[PDB]
Write a protein that binds this ligand. Structure first.
Ligand SMILES: COC(=O)C[C@](O)(CCCC(C)(C)O)C(=O)O[C@@H]1C(OC)=C[C@]23CCCN2CCc2cc4c(cc2[C@H]13)OCO4
Ligand SMILES: [Cl-]
Ligand SMILES: [Cl-]
Ligand SMILES: [Cl-]
Ligand SMILES: [K+]
Ligand SMILES: [Mg+2]
Ligand SMILES: [Mg+2]
Ligand SMILES: [Mg+2]
Ligand SMILES: [Mg+2]
Ligand SMILES: [Mg+2]
Ligand SMILES: [Mg+2]
Ligand SMILES: [Mg+2]
Ligand SMILES: [Mg+2]
Ligand SMILES: [Mg+2]
Ligand SMILES: [Mg+2]
Ligand SMILES: [Mg+2]
Ligand SMILES: [Mg+2]
Ligand SMILES: [Mg+2]
Ligand SMILES: [Mg+2]
Ligand SMILES: [Mg+2]
Ligand SMILES: [Mg+2]
Ligand SMILES: [Mg+2]
Ligand SMILES: [Mg+2]
Ligand SMILES: [Mg+2]
Ligand SMILES: [Mg+2]
Ligand SMILES: [Mg+2]
Ligand SMILES: [Mg+2]
Ligand SMILES: [Mg+2]
Ligand SMILES: [Mg+2]
Ligand SMILES: [Mg+2]
Ligand SMILES: [Mg+2]
Ligand SMILES: [Mg+2]
Ligand SMILES: [Mg+2]
Ligand SMILES: [Mg+2]
Ligand SMILES: [Mg+2]
Ligand SMILES: [Mg+2]
Ligand SMILES: [Mg+2]
Ligand SMILES: [Mg+2]
Ligand SMILES: [Mg+2]
Ligand code: NA
Ligand code: NA
Ligand code: NA
Ligand code: NA
Ligand code: NA
Ligand code: NA
Ligand code: NA
Ligand code: NA
Ligand code: NA
Ligand code: NA
Ligand code: NA
Ligand code: NA
Ligand code: NA
Ligand code: NA
Ligand code: NA
Ligand code: NA
Ligand code: NA
Ligand SMILES: [Sr+2]
Ligand SMILES: [Sr+2]
Ligand SMILES: [Sr+2]
Ligand SMILES: [Sr+2]
Ligand SMILES: [Sr+2]
Ligand SMILES: [Sr+2]
Ligand SMILES: [Sr+2]
Ligand SMILES: [Sr+2]
Ligand SMILES: [Sr+2]
Ligand SMILES: [Sr+2]
Ligand SMILES: [Sr+2]
Ligand SMILES: [Sr+2]
Ligand SMILES: [Sr+2]
Ligand SMILES: [Sr+2]
Ligand SMILES: [Sr+2]
Ligand SMILES: [Sr+2]
Ligand SMILES: [Sr+2]
Ligand SMILES: [Sr+2]
Ligand SMILES: [Sr+2]
Ligand SMILES: [Sr+2]
Ligand SMILES: [Sr+2]
Ligand SMILES: [Sr+2]
Ligand SMILES: [Sr+2]
Ligand SMILES: [Sr+2]
Ligand SMILES: [Sr+2]
Ligand SMILES: [Sr+2]
Ligand SMILES: [Sr+2]
Ligand SMILES: [Sr+2]
Ligand SMILES: [Sr+2]
Ligand SMILES: [Sr+2]
Ligand SMILES: [Sr+2]
Ligand SMILES: [Sr+2]
Ligand SMILES: [Sr+2]
Ligand SMILES: [Sr+2]
Ligand SMILES: [Sr+2]
Ligand SMILES: [Sr+2]
Ligand SMILES: [Sr+2]
Ligand SMILES: [Sr+2]
Ligand SMILES: [Sr+2]
Ligand SMILES: [Sr+2]
Ligand SMILES: [Sr+2]
Ligand SMILES: [Sr+2]
Ligand SMILES: [Sr+2]
Lengths: 56, 73, 237
RNA sequence: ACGACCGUAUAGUACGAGAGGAACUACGGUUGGUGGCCACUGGUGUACCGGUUGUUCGAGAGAGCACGUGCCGGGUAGCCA
RNA sequence: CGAGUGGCUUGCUACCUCGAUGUCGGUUCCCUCCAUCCUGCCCGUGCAGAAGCGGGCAAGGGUGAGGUUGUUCGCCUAUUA
RNA sequence: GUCGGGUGAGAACCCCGACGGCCUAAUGGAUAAGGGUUCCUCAGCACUGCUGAUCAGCUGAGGGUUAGCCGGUCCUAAGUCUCACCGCAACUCGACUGAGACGAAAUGGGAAACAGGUUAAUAUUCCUGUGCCAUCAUGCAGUGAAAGUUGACGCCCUGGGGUCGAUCACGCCGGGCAUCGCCCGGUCGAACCGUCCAACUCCGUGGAAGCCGUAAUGGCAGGAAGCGGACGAACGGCGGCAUAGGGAAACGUGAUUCAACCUGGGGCCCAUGAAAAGACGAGCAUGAUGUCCGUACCGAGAACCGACACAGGUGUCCAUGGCGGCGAAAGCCAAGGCCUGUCGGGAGCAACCAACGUUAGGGAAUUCGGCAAGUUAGUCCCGUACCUUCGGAAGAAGGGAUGCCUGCUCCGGAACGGAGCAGGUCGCAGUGACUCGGAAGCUCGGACUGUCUAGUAACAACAUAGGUGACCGCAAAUCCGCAAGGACUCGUACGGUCACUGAAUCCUGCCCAGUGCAGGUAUCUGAACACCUCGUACAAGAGGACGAAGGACCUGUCAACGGCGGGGGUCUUAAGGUAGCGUAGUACCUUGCCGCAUCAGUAGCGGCUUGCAUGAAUGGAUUAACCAGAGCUUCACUGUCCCAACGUUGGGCCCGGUGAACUGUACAUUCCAGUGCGGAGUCUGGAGACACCCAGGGGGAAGCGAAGACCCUAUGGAGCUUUACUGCAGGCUGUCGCUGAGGACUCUCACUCCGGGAGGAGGACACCGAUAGCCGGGCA
RNA sequence: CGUGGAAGUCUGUUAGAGUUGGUGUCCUACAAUACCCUCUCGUGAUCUAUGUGUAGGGGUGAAAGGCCCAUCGAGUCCGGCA
């Protein structure tokens, strides 16, 4: 079985969904954690300094 | 009794299974009565079809050489 | 390199864990104050998935249904006694002081009241030898003379399920089934059959170990493989 | 677009003590190559005709499907060696 | 011992290509060279004949089938002008 | 697909009919996920649709999903999260322990619904009829009430009960066919309420010393059969339900085999096969309440994933439609679906190509190699070698039979089950298609089933049982974490950790010098702290004494890394190659020599064998069985070949429509020679050359595709190794702190562990913090 | 002689799993691993759906440096970074 086209057929699982906190389709319905805002992981909003260039 | 193993496994592997299963499916004397009606239920578990006596013995023998030494002292 | 198999073990992941949820009972001795007036009738003989030997279901006088480590020759209907003034019969639990010398014993405690540590596997037994006011010398299944406290409880008789090791597994499938009930990753790939990145004995154009197999005690995890602190190796000499 | 070989007559002759043994020439054929052709032999021939198994159309009759003929037997023209 | 010709072998060189000129052997199809294996015509002979040996002209045609081996090469078999 | 016809400005492909086809575990029916309006209606063709379109999953506008009893919801599973606690410099980090919550929509558990009718679209939801459950209220009953049962369970074999279906018999209703009189369809009717009960178990009677019983095991004076009885099943029978429903009508009755469902018997485990909520236990009437969420449609060669209306991928149930046959096989045909695996028209339709049929004679001559193809084939009877681990080899091999028709026999209760007999008879051919092994031998490897490089390797590699060695008594060995802590472990030496070898059988020699590990050690060496001397009004610093692990030294150990030679009738460096095997998958020489086989054999097999450079768990030898593993031989077979031909289907070619890409410095009709950075269509000299177009097979453009993976170079990168350099973890060990009382010792009060507790073990040690020495490719 | 019905047992395109050869077809594909025939396994170390766990010098690995979303001798994203 090839890792390409024939392995894409098994993809009918729902993981990332619309988030209650931020509205992005990043709420992992199995982990109960948002990959965008950090809902379910932290009270503080997920933000990092590397999301922009160092002097900006 | 190792004819289920066919032409596979070798002498020692299927000769030692034959000896151990011949002395397991054999008629054993019961500790309650005296009848030769003790059969195996599982690993170490033995039972008599006469008086419903379910007991502990060896894995394949209802009495081990070390189990008979306990009766002495 | 990459962490060796023995290092992945300690992380306690699913593959290395025992199927605890499929296990029956933690076979410990009963908690009596002092008096011996605790006895019970054997209700059933069950198979223990953790030790591949039988375990006796006993119901006590006060109404406690507990699974006990079954010795050889214990059946349904039989009465077992647990306490200081208990009868010297096979299947009874009483401290080493009260048990006579030269009698094969099993499920021996290390520190009094722990519930039993030694001589628990199929068909084995500990031999009680010397008595004193201070010490009870017990000969464990390995042949070691263990000096123990006479207040350590133990069950009379050899453990049930003797001779298990006598019959060969014959086929890999039988081993598979036994191993699926234990806390072990099976099958075993030889280190000598691996890549250098995976094991100290891995690599080469042919299969042979790198350096010698006898490793020092002071060796770190990732290097402690082969013959750990061997006093000697081989059969002859 | 022809190349080459074998055989017969020459001749058991010339030559040679003998053993052995030619040629010119005239013939017949073979092989390789070449071009063409199908009366003859052969192949094909899901044109065609027949036999026959399974199943469906109620039976019969007569048919469909079974890979582009179900299978088997015969095979015209043409195309071919 | 001396003088050469070729450019099939091998060696030497590092001129050409490293923003790639697809490596051996085989096969298939075409052209060519002559230092000619056969075939045509010749000269010599330690040329009687027969069968050969050596040499000259000559590249029209031919130079095939097989056993081991990936083999080129080579060894081997039976045919062959 | 074709002929008619319908609609329309327009029709090959939108619709109707007919004729002809395709799909049968799917191309049918119901669904999970996933999609998200794709569903229905109307209006459309700018877009999308492999051509066209009046059609549409497209465009626009409207409309559509109705529940006490179908799911969710509730329960708990592997497991997840939250809070508390503790750790961490710290946290959104982290293990344990508590408490709480979360965790199952086809497919775990679970209170209760069936039949019909209706819509363009929903339907166990709406409507009609009938029924059922839970809670609460009232009334009667009841004082029981919680023990117990259920929920609730593995794999293999099997009996009994039994429905749908299928088939057989006969009858009724309707249809079809028309030499017959056969063929098809239907002949209905639920939930629920009531009732019946086989199996199991048990009780009374009885009294077997050999009987009872089974498909099989089995049962019994500790009481068999027989007799009577208690308890007790179906989604089953029976009655109601039903002058309900449904049908144009009839609106059946018996039978066999029997999925579902019910209920038993047996066997296996170094394997032991969930839990909880809930229910039962525990009556009846009447009345009330039963909210919230899902519900359309697709579920795929066009509704999902794969950029696509993708030949890929994607779970469940229908596994009982007919013939066929062992069959959920083939082939054919129903029900149902479809002509959308969606561009057509034309040319005996050329070459060439893809799939394929048939080829005389020869028969592997082909080729690295029988690659490809072919041969064989189902079933019964006969018959069957070497070898062998006695299982097997084995369907060895080889030989014979095989249809139809008439009349029968035997087994069984019987089958529309099976096994046979006699006579008759047709063909080239009777497993007539279909389905359906080619066979034998020698050698190598791995014992076997199994595993693997998703995407060039399926193998001899990995695994395996088996063999072996190592570590550890559990406050362990081994391992994870910075820590708090954790795996192994609901475990305890018949254990489980760490390694090697790789079934069985016969065996497994010699070497401890080096390296490794381990034990010991008079003596030697061996850090810091404290101590002593010198020095400094102190300090830096120099020296001494003491001396841990470690090292030196000694010993043990090779199924520990490994080694098993040269010379002469010892030397290096410990030993000096034993059984075996041997020109090997190891042998350079080498196509070794002899033999076998062939016309011929670098092959293969046997023998020899001085072995360039075999050899004993770096396991040696050997070996039955097994194998999409490597090599060789024989029979059979054949288009692999001699040597090619003809045919079949789809392309190719012409026409309508649709309509890319690769590639492009320029010029360009070239050829032969030469020259040039030595491999020129373009320079030089000649030769040839009127332009354009069609088809072709690919000689050239050192053709197109990819800043060569080879090679070197760069004070480039990375992975990996080690007795490279330097360091970092980790282990061992001394010392200081915790830390206390009276070079060896006692104690208990810190501290640790065990114990529910009382209390017990240990104890100034251990743990932990700090520092010092040793080891230290585990890591950087 | 029968009964019994064991087995990492055999035949088998049952379902299902796998992938030996053709070095066939395709190779601006139907397809960034496809098609056809052939072939292997198919009661077990079996296959499979869903839920769940292990995370980057880390997992996972019957070991091929295999696999960890077309990405692996150290995933991916962004940042360091011009
Ligand atoms: C070592 O041999 C190779 O590496 C072969 C190849 O890798 C073939 C490449 C084929 C491609 C990929 C370019 O199609 C290659 O690049 O070859 C070069 C190559 O590739 C273009 C061509 C070369 C360059 C000089 C001519 N020669 C012809 C082929 C060749 C053959 C070789 C050779 C080199 C060449 C080079 O070593 C000996 O065998
Ligand atoms: Cl084990
Ligand atoms: Cl639902
Ligand atoms: Cl039965
Ligand atoms: K080059
Ligand atoms: Mg326990
Ligand atoms: Mg073992
Ligand atoms: Mg496990
Ligand atoms: Mg192994
Ligand atoms: Mg490897
Ligand atoms: Mg490698
Ligand atoms: Mg390493
Ligand atoms: Mg080896
Ligand atoms: Mg080895
Ligand atoms: Mg080229
Ligand atoms: Mg000349
Ligand atoms: Mg010429
Ligand atoms: Mg319309
Ligand atoms: Mg509908
Ligand atoms: Mg389509
Ligand atoms: Mg022929
Ligand atoms: Mg040849
Ligand atoms: Mg073949
Ligand atoms: Mg009869
Ligand atoms: Mg060989
Ligand atoms: Mg194998
Ligand atoms: Mg591969
Ligand atoms: Mg394979
Ligand atoms: Mg082993
Ligand atoms: Mg072992
Ligand atoms: Mg191996
Ligand atoms: Mg030889
Ligand atoms: Mg040895
Ligand atoms: Mg380059
Ligand atoms: Mg290189
Ligand atoms: Mg580097
Ligand atoms: Mg504790
Ligand atoms: Mg390094
Ligand atoms: Mg999973
Ligand atoms: Na020259
Ligand atoms: Na070539
Ligand atoms: Na010539
Ligand atoms: Na040759
Ligand atoms: Na169309
Ligand atoms: Na009933
Ligand atoms: Na049938
Ligand atoms: Na198998
Ligand atoms: Na040594
Ligand atoms: Na050696
Ligand atoms: Na052919
Ligand atoms: Na060309
Ligand atoms: Na690297
Ligand atoms: Na028998
Ligand atoms: Na395949
Ligand atoms: Na296999
Ligand atoms: Na990484
Ligand atoms: Sr999935
Ligand atoms: Sr969280
Ligand atoms: Sr931030
Ligand atoms: Sr405890
Ligand atoms: Sr315990
Ligand atoms: Sr190695
Ligand atoms: Sr020895
Ligand atoms: Sr003559
Ligand atoms: Sr003569
Ligand atoms: Sr036909
Ligand atoms: Sr046939
Ligand atoms: Sr000349
Ligand atoms: Sr000549
Ligand atoms: Sr050459
Ligand atoms: Sr040679
Ligand atoms: Sr459907
Ligand atoms: Sr238009
Ligand atoms: Sr529609
Ligand atoms: Sr819940
Ligand atoms: Sr359910
Ligand atoms: Sr039945
Ligand atoms: Sr629906
Ligand atoms: Sr599909
Ligand atoms: Sr595929
Ligand atoms: Sr039909
Ligand atoms: Sr279309
Ligand atoms: Sr014919
Ligand atoms: Sr041959
Ligand atoms: Sr040949
Ligand atoms: Sr035969
Ligand atoms: Sr795979
Ligand atoms: Sr062996
Ligand atoms: Sr040594
Ligand atoms: Sr010798
Ligand atoms: Sr062309
Ligand atoms: Sr490259
Ligand atoms: Sr099988
Ligand atoms: Sr290949
Ligand atoms: Sr194709
Ligand atoms: Sr390809
Ligand atoms: Sr083929
Ligand atoms: Sr099979
Ligand atoms: Sr950057």
């Amino acid at each position: 079985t090839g890792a390409g086209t024939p392995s894409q057929g098994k993809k009918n699982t729902t993981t990332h969904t619309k988030c209650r906190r931020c509205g992005e389709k990043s709420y992992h319905t199995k982990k109960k954690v948002c990959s965008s805002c950090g809902f379910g992981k932290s009270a503080k909003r997920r933000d990092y300094e590397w999301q922009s260039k160092a002097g900006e | 009794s190792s004819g289920r193993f066919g032409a596979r496994y070798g002498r020692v592997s299927r000769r030692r299974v034959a000896e151990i299963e011949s002395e397991m499916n054999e008629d054993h004397a019961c500790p309650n009565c005296g009848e030769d009606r003790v059969d195996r239920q599982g690993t170490g578990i033995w039972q008599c079809s006469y008086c419903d006596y379910k007991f502990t013995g060896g894995s394949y023998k209802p009495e081990t050489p070390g189990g008979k030494t306990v009766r002495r002292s | 390199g990459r962490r060796i198999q023995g290092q992945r073990r300690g992380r306690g992941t699913s593959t290395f864990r025992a199927p605890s949820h499929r296990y029956k009972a933690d076979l410990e001795h009963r908690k009596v104050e002092d008096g011996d007036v605790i006895a019970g009738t054997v209700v059933d003989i069950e198979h223990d998935p953790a030790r591949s030997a039988p375990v006796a279901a006993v119901e006590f006088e006060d109404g406690d249904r507990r699974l006990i480590l079954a010795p050889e020759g214990v059946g349904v209907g039989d009465e077992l006694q647990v306490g200081v003034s208990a009868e010297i019969a096979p299947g009874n639990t009483l401290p080493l002081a009260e048990i006579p010398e030269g009698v094969p014993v099993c499920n021996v405690e290390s520190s009094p009241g722990d519930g039993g540590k030694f001589a628990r596997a199929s068909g084995v037994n500990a031999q009680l030898l010397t008595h004193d006011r201070n010490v009870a010398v017990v000969k464990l299944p390995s042949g070691e003379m263990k000096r123990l406290d006479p207040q350590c409880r133990a069950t009379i008789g050899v453990v049930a399920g003797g001779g298990r090791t006598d019959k060969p597994f014959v086929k890999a499938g039988n081993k598979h089934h036994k191993m699926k009930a234990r806390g072990t990753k099976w099958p075993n790939v030889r280190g000598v059959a691996m890549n250098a990145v995976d094991h100290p004995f891995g690599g080469g154009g042919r299969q042979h170990p790198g350096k010698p197999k006898s490793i020092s005690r002071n060796a770190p995890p990732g290097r402690k493989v082969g013959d750990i602190a061997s006093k000697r190796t081989g059969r002859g000499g």
